[PDB]
Amino acid sequence: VSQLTQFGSTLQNIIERQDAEALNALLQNQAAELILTNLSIQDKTIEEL
């Protein structure tokens, strides 16, 4: 049983790291997609000048 509890603690640590890394990967996709509109705005500011 104490061996099982040890597998359960390793498993919980894996659970936490998996989803912290899925959020970490998600944020970079959101940042990459948010950048394109800023590029369009800056280019069109040039046309304003």
Partner: protein
């Protein structure tokens, strides 16, 4: 002689109407480009939205 002086007075007045008409035409022309710049700015705010 007063006939000639009146003639030249009307001619100088007409030249001043060239100064005024050309000034108005130039101001009108620059306003259109101001509108073009604000159209770019307005659709830039749309892209920011």
């Amino acid at each position: 002689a007063d006939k000639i002086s009146q003639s030249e007075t009307y001619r100088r007045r007409r030249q001043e109407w060239e100064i005024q008409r050309n000034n108005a035409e130039a101001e009108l022309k620059q306003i259109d480009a101001q509108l073009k710049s604000l159209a770019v700015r307005r659709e830039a705010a749309v892209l920011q939205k």
